[PDB]
Amino acid sequence: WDMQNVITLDTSFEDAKTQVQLKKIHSSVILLYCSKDEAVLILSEARSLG
Amino acid sequence: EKENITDPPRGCVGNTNIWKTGPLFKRVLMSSKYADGVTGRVEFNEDGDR
Ligand SMILES: *[C@@H]1O[C@H](CO)[C@@H](O)[C@H](O)[C@H]1NC(C)=O
Numbered sequence: 001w002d003m004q005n006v007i008t009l010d011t012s013f014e015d016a017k018t019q020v021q022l023k024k025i026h027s028s029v030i031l032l033y034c035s036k037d038e039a040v041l042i043l044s045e046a047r048s049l050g
Numbered sequence: 051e052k053e054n055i056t057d058p059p060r061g062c063v064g065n066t067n068i069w070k071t072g073p074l075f076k077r078v079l080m081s082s083k084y085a086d087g088v089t090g091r092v093e094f095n096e097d098g099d100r
């Protein structure tokens with residue numbers, strides 16, 4: 001498996017450090033493991049960052 | 051000192067949703083660096099310990 005390294009979210013998003021972690025993502029399948037509203041915020045930030 | 055101050059409401063009547071700024075207050079407690087203490091200098095680690 002061509003597995004990209006594990007992106008870890010420690011705290012709430014600042015759009016300073018988590019933005020860099022989202023810019024490191026260049027693979028195809030993104031596996032997300034969080035709650036519901038956190039998934040809503042992560043998908044909204046991914047839509048805002050393209 | 052920070053903004054977006056929310057409060058946990060009266061959960062027994064009409065309030066079943068959780069307090070949404072939980073990880074915000076958790077990030078405040080994790081980043082709480084101190085120089086004061088009678089027993090000694092206390093500072094939270096990445097697990098929130100001494
Ligand atoms: C405070 O909350 C509002 C509404 O959710 C949001 O637009 C704003 O960005 C928040 N403040 C900061 C500094 O993030």
Ligand SMILES: *[C@@H]1O[C@H](CO)[C@@H](O)[C@H](O)[C@H]1NC(C)=O
Pocket residue numbers: 089090091092
């Ligand atoms: C341990 O004791 C020494 C006694 O001088 C004190 O200076 C030090 O702050 C203590 N360690 C901590 C950080 O609890």
